[PDB]
Design a protein around this ligand. Structure first.
Ligand SMILES: Cc1cc2nc3c(=O)[nH]c(=O)nc-3n(C[C@H](O)[C@H](O)[C@H](O)COP(=O)(O)OP(=O)(O)OC[C@H]3O[C@@H](n4cnc5c(N)ncnc54)[C@H](O)[C@@H]3O)c2cc1C
Ligand SMILES: O=C(O)c1ccccc1O
Length: 411
């Protein structure tokens, strides 16, 4: 060991917090760490299981009461609530957790010494022997390797991209906004009963499709609350804008929603009407980056590949980043002078998949809203694409990917 590997992780937010937990174990590594609700698919599982939290997650996270627990979503048309199809993810189904609670349960299993609160980074500089963080603090830290997990607005992203000779990249408003509510299930069963509606729609997660919008629901608190997220999209401007400075969240009225879902049937309308105080969220992402790495620094999580939530996939990609990165650093063979090269390996393994996840989250946005060329609102073709489209994401083998986390070959 003599000199262990010095690794800084910037951003205390799931990807970061989990890469630190990832690295913790290694002992020959020295590591320090500088929607108000989330979803996890089948491919997150292997990652969570790994980082030693299956057990705990599996208890704290919401799930759809049995036996409906394996259903990801039932897909329906908004206008009459009729069925288009269903995506089943056996085992996981609709799995979700309050963000606060997830992060927290990571960082509270994190052997003391690693968390390093006050500091956020404005800048960094590097030699080839050193990468040095500039805290606002006015102070500094220096390491062999720095992994930026500082989210969609990442400072570090654009230091890196400018260093690597690429244009900077900022959050782009997607044109889509989300009204979100949380509703007492009993209250809605009453309403549903009152209007002769199928009460199945409240027990199993649903997505209702309409032109330029969609509404999803899923039960939480073992069935007693319903999460409702009503998505609306304007595709008039070819590149839409959010007010120079509003925050990305604000409150909104129950009629500002209903106005956008005028074409929907009474199932959807009842759901929309049950939300008394809807918040609205402006959804941002960015185009895939030309690289995630330069020198001794690498981007993970939303800082690398922020995305629309339409495939419930963003966190999971952060977790796959984290897992692979833990395995890559933290492999006793690997040392300071390997870092530039090993990071460019991370890039080769991960950039493609995550970029393609970003893009297919935009594509899902359009599919759910009757905009996919070749498909639009056609029931049979919608069915076929919905029922297969998550596979390449879900059915990925993290184990095998880990085997690629190794110094090159030269041979
Ligand atoms: C309105 C909204 C809804 C979302 N819904 C989902 C969802 O359903 N499923 C999902 O997987 N992701 C969702 N996301 C994104 C999800 O929160 C991120 O993928 C994940 O938290 C990013 O991991 P990170 O490590 O990049 O964290 P970071 O966001 O990088 O946290 C780092 C922060 O702490 C400190 C740093 O300076 C920085 O500010 C949503 C985001 C928004 C804005
Ligand atoms: O839980 C969510 O907010 C979500 C949003 C879009 C698509 C799938 C999802 O689980």
């Amino acid at each position: 060991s003599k000199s262990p590997l010095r690794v800084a992780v910037i951003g205390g937010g799931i990807a970061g917090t989990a890469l630190a937990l990832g690295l913790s174990k290694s002992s020959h590594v020295n590591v320090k760490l500088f929607g108000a609700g989330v979803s996890f698919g089948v491919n997150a599982v292997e990652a969570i299981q790994r980082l030693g939290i299956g057990e705990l997650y599996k208890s704290v996270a919401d799930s759809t009461p049995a036996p409906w627990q394996d259903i990801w979503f039932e897909w329906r048309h908004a206008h009459d609530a009729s069925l288009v199809g269903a995506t089943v993810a056996p085992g996981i189904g609709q799995s979700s957790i309050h963000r606060a609670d997830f992060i927290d349960m990571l960082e509270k299993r994190l052997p003391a010494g690693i968390a390093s609160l006050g500091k956020h980074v404005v800048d960094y500089t590097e030699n080839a022997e050193g990468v040095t963080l500039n805290f606002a603090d006015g102070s500094t830290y220096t390491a062999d390797v720095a992994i930026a997990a500082d989210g969609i607005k990442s400072s570090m992203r654009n230091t890196l991209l400018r260093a690597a000779g690429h244009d900077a990249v900022h959050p782009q408003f997607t044109g889509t906004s989300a009204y979100r509510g949380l509703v007492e299930t009993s209250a809605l069963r009453e309403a549903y009963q009152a209007a002769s509606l199928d009460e199945h729609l409240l027990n199993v997660p649903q997505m209702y499709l309409i032109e330029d919008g969609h509404v999803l629901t899923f039960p939480v608190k073992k069935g007693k609350l319903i999460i409702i997220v009503a998505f609306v999209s304007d595709r008039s401007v070819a590149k839409p804008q959010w007010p120079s400075d509003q925050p990305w969240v604000r409150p909104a009225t129950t009629d500002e929603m209903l106005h956008r879902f005028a074409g929907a049937g009474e199932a959807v309308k009842t759901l929309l009407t049950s939300i008394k105080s809807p918040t609205l969220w402006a959804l941002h992402d960015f185009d895939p980056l030309p690289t995630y790495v330069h020198g001794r620094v690498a981007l993970i999580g939303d800082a690398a590949h922020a995305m629309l939530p339409h495939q419930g996939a963003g966190a999971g990609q952060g977790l796959e980043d984290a897992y692979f990165m833990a395995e890559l650093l933290g492999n006793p063979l690997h040392e300071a002078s390997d870092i530039p090269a090993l990071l460019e390996v991370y890039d080769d393994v991960r950039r493609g998949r995550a970029s393609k996840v970003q893009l297919t989250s935009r594509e899902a946005g359009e599919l759910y809203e009757y905009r996919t060329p070749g498909v639009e609102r056609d029931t049979a073709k919608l069915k076929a694409l919905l029922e297969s489209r998550m596979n390449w994401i879900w059915n990925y083998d993290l184990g095998a990917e880990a085997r690629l986390a190794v110094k090159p070959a030269l041979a």
